[PDB]
């Protein structure tokens, strides 16, 4: 009756995550001045380079040099010895206006509530009662391991740490009438960029004692748990120098860690009219509302859109057998309680607010009581 499931997370300095954070720093900078900015900002990172490419139509005056460099500073890349330095790297900009053909078909001369979806696409939300925050334990633990690394880097207790990290957690679960129950941690991987001086044994001991034991409850760890700590043996070169980064290349880290499903679209760098983001946030909100409302223990929600059309083309509910109500009944409850037009989601979830950089590391869900994490009280 038991099975394994694995999820990963990455740190703030993983090169793809750098790009997500920069893209959302750009979005936030625009929204601070123009709440209706149309933003589709992709970021690419390689040795010494941040490139911004995409489409922005906005009344804001944004200093891209400053915004990019401040984001990199916050992440911690502040010296050539670390492989990347916000003070001295190249920032290149290839940004144009939003296509007028898109604008006319999506939002021009439309009532805000009746704005069209900014694109076609499909999106999923997911929730599971296995944690209070309604997220899979595998990814929660993986994120917290990366957060702990950043904490110990920033507080100076492990000064050999650098910002680029990856973690991976395999949990053994039991099945429980469609719900899942975590039993134990089967395997943990941690890889983190480090300075030239620290030895492998010092790092592996610190990762076990000061990172894993600080994060993972002892009840989940036992004599059989497998640890792969600095498994490559050496990780001095890191950040964009070690591996090119791009926005939207961590979409499973950003969401459910392999659980649930994904429609494919990236979140970062996009304003609310891009339903890839807003409708995925709304679908999470629906899923979490169903679980916290006691209607089911685990649920997957699909929605889809066509460019220029406000109402979703399809809505689907999959409850894994964890409700007394049928999926059809849950779908009817959802349709009676939620309006998933993007021009309504923006109001319900306050999606013109410049909080997006905060979403761009450690997952978009299960944290911080963002609006999509506050369940809606359902009438049925």
Q: Which residues are annotated as a binding site for L-methionine?
A: 55, 98, 243, 274
The answer to whether residue 244 is catalytic is yes
Q: Which residue is nearest to K ion (CB)?
A: 244
Please, what is the minimum distance in Å from the beta carbon of residue 36 to Mg ion?
22
> Would you say 282 and 274 are in contact if contact means Cβ atoms under 8 Å apart?
no
Q: Strand 245-246 to strand 226-229: parallel, antiparallel, or no bridges (unpaired)? A: unpaired
Q: Which stretch binds a copy of itself (CB under 8 A): 61-69, 204-212, 250-258, 284-292?
A: 250-258
The answer to whether residue 166 is catalytic is yes
> Would you say 142 and 9 are in contact if contact means Cβ atoms under 8 Å apart?
yes
Which is nearer to a copy of itself, 111 or 232 (by Cβ)?
232
The answer to whether residue 270 is catalytic is yes
User: What is the CB-side half-sphere exposure of residue 126 using CA atoms within 13 A?
Assistant: 21
Sheet of strand 298-305, all strands in order from the earlier edge strand to the far edge: 121-128, 298-305, 314-318
CA distance 284 to 365: 8
CA distance 95 to 296: 45
Residue 196 has a CB neighbour count (10 Å cut-off) of: 8
Please, what is the minimum distance in Å from the beta carbon of residue 267 to a copy of itself?
12
Residues 91-150 that bind a copy of itself (CB under 8 A): 94, 96, 99-102, 104-106, 116, 120-122, 124
Q: Residues 223-252: x/- map of binding to ligand MTA (CB under 6 A)?
A: ---------x-xx--x---xx---------
DSSP state of 81: G
Q: Residues 87-106: x/- map of binding to ligand MTA (CB under 6 A)?
A: ------------x-xx--x-
Q: Using CB under 5 A as the criterion, which residues of the chain lie in contact with Mg ion when the complex forms?
A: 16, 249
* Among 12, 28, 276, 373, the one annotated catalytic: 276
Out of Na ion, K ion, Mg ion, none, which partner does residue 16 contact, by CB within 5 to 8 A per kind? Answer: Mg ion
Binding residues, as ranges, are 14, 16, 42, 55, 98, 164-166, 232-235, 243, 249-250, 266, 270, 274, 276
Binding residues for K(+), as ranges, are 42
DSSP state of 264: S
Strand residues in 97-210 grouped as ranges (E): 121-128, 161-176, 179-194
CA distance 144 to 192: 14
* Among 143, 270, 284, 288, the one annotated catalytic: 270
Which is nearer to a copy of itself, 18 or 292 (by Cβ)?
18
Q: How many helices (H) and strands (E) does the chain have?
A: 9, 13
Beta bridge partners of 168: 8, 189
CA distance 275 to 308: 11
Please give the size of the binding site for ligand MTA, defined by CB under 6 A. Answer: 17
Of 154, 153, 149, 151, nearest to 166 (Cα)?
A: 149
Residues sharing a CB contact under 8 Å with residue 81, sequence separation 6 or more, in sequence order: 195
Q: Does residue number 292 form part of the binding site for ligand MTA (CB under 6 A)?
A: no
The first and second tokens of residue 276, run together, are 């890839």
Q: Does residue number 7 form part of the binding site for a copy of itself (CB under 8 A)?
A: yes
Q: Residues 216-255: x/- map of binding to K ion (CB under 5 A)?
A: ---------------------------xx-----------
The answer to whether residue 14 is catalytic is yes
Please, what is the minimum distance in Å from the beta carbon of residue 210 to ligand MTA?
19
Active site residues: 14, 16-17, 42, 55, 166, 235, 243-244, 249-250, 270, 274, 276
Give the footprint of K ion on this chain (CB under 5 A): 243-244
């Amino acid at each position: 009756g038991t099975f394994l499931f694995t999820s990963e997370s990455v740190g703030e300095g993983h090169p793809d995550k750098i790009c997500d954070q920069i893209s959302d720093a750009v979005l936030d900078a625009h929204l601070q001045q123009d709440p209706d900015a149309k933003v589709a900002c992709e970021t690419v990172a390689k040795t010494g380079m941040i490139l911004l490419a995409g489409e922005i139509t906005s009344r804001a005056a944004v200093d891209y040099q400053k915004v990019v460099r401040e984001a990199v500073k916050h992440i911690g890349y502040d010296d050539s010895s670390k492989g990347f330095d916000y003070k001295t790297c190249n920032v290149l900009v290839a940004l144009e206006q939003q296509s007028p053909d898109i604008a006319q078909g999506v939002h021009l001369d439309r009532n805000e509530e009746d704005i069209g979806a900014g694109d076609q696409g499909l999106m999923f939300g997911y929730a599971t009662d296995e944690t209070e925050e309604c997220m899979p334990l595998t990814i929660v633990l993986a994120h917290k391991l990366n957060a702990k690394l950043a904490e110990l880097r920033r507080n100076g207790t492990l000064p050999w740490l650098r910002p680029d990290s990856k973690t991976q957690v395999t949990v053994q679960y039991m099945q429980d009438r469609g719900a899942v129950l975590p039993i134990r941690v089967h395997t943990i991987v941690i890889s983190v960029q480090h300075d030239e001086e620290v030895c492998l044994d010092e790092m592996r001991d610190a990762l076990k004692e000061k990172v894993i034991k600080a994060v993972v409850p002892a009840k989940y760890l036992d004599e059989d748990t497998i640890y792969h700590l600095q498994p490559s043996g050496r990780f001095v070169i890191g950040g964009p120098q070690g591996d090119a980064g791009l926005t939207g290349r961590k979409i499973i880290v950003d969401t459910y860690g392999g659980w649930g499903a994904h429609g494919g679209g990236a979140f970062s760098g996009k304003d609310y009219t891009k339903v890839d983001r807003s409708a995925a946030y709304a679908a999470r909100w629906v899923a979490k509302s169903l679980v916290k409302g006691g209607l089911c223990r685990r649920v997957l929600v699909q929605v889809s859109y066509a460019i220029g059309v406000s109402h979703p083309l399809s809505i689907s509910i999959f409850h894994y057998g964890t409700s007394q109500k049928s999926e059809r009944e849950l779908l009817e409850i959802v349709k009676k309680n939620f309006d998933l037009r993007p021009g309504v989601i923006v109001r319900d979830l306050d999606l013109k607010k410049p909080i997006y950089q905060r979403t761009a590391a450690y997952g978009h869900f299960g944290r911080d009581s963002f609006p999509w994490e506050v369940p809606k009280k359902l009438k049925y």
